[PDB]
Amino acid sequence: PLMVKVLDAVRGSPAINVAVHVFRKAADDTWEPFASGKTSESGELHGLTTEEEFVEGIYKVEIDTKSYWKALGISPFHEHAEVVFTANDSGPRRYTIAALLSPYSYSTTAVVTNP
Amino acid sequence: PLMVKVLDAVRGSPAINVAVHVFRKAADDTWEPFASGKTSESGELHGLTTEEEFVEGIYKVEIDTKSYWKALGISPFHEHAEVVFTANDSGPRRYTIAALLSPYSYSTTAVVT
Amino acid sequence: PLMVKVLDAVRGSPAINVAVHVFRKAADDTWEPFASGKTSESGELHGLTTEEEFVEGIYKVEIDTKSYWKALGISPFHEHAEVVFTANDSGPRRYTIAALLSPYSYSTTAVVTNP
Amino acid sequence: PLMVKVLDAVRGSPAINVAVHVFRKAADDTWEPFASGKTSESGELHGLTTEEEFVEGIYKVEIDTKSYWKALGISPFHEHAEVVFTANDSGPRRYTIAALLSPYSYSTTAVVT
Ligand SMILES: Nc1cc(Cl)cc(Cl)c1
């Protein structure tokens, strides 16, 4: 139900080995760690959760873009790219969170499908 | 030293009356809110800080995109758009944070001079 | 070797049934029709060419974004989204041309892989 | 009535000295070039046309992105970025064509007032 895809707009390639941390907001308001992983050679990260665990809630996906650029010798603008959204408010959906990275810019898009 | 500009990709216009909150990261790793405003008729927000107060640090700019889309009667995906950056790491700079908004996508860019 | 993917940034979905026309620039400078098709239910168009036909050259991918919006009742800004690029200049590559559509904006990205 | 603004997503700056050519579609479906310029130190190009000459029609704005990246020593994907639009269909408007450039990606947006 949740996939993250990261692309590099400088090289026109997948952004490989990008760390991603996902959090869910608890009923106390705090950000509870929910899942993490790193992007594969295709720039994708699958397997973060399951339909049953991925309940309604407010989720945050934090993509460690700074470390990605630093490893390429670049000092980028952003510390990270953070995507915050309410999920499954009108029933279960599949979410693809895509990010397109440049040193001084990022774009993010959600593709939401009803399986 | 800090300006925010917001555009609406649906209407082809400045995004007017968008709330923007700015925070500085505190020593305890919490976000200390210290400036806010809303975008003008040109989609711009000026006057958030001054040269003397805008010292090196990590800053967060939160743009209340959800409220903007709700006011237009359009279903949005994100809660907000957040920009987090280390400022002034090599000297004081002028920063323009530009955001281009769609209901299920946004982009943000920094123009640093 | 050539795939086109189109997404709708208003609904967070694939842009389905989008017409795409591909042209190649001839040695006379004119744009020669090369391939066409329409995006599937996943927003993707595959099967446009083959490794052997997709020689070095300058290609244009024209995505009929206006008709897509018009069918949704919208009068968009752009007539189309046109992506023009030199292909295979340093040997055969696979190209994914992605476009992200809004009524008054579009983004386009190339992912280029070496198989 | 027509301004072009170009930003560089790699450097976090205006894209300076970028060539821009504007064309109007002719009755024979050919593109008739009629204005050009290059972006200023602020990434902007003003003064392309006037209210009287900018009549309804289909216009193309071609931004020479390839030359810009070559001048920076960066390998680019696209030949150029092209924006094609019908102008003034509902009255005269002011158009700002904004482009945000990366070597393998670009976005373009219209701000129409
Ligand atoms: N001014 C501006 C233009 C585009 Cl096309 C994208 C972004 Cl983030 C800003």
Residue numbers in the entry:
A (entry chain A), C (entry chain A): 11 to 125
B (entry chain B), D (entry chain B): 11 to 123
Q: What does the original paper state about this entry?
A:
Transthyretin (TTR) is a homotetrameric plasma protein (also present in cerebrospinal fluid) with two thyroxine binding sites. There are two structurally identical thyroxine binding sites in between the dimer-dimer interface with a line of 2-fold symmetry running across the binding channel (red line). In the absence of bound ligand, the tetramer is prone to dissociation and subunit misfolding that generates the precursors for amyloid fibre formation. Binding of thyroxine or other ligands could stabilise the TTR tetramer by forming non-covalent bonds to each monomer, effectively “securing” them in position.
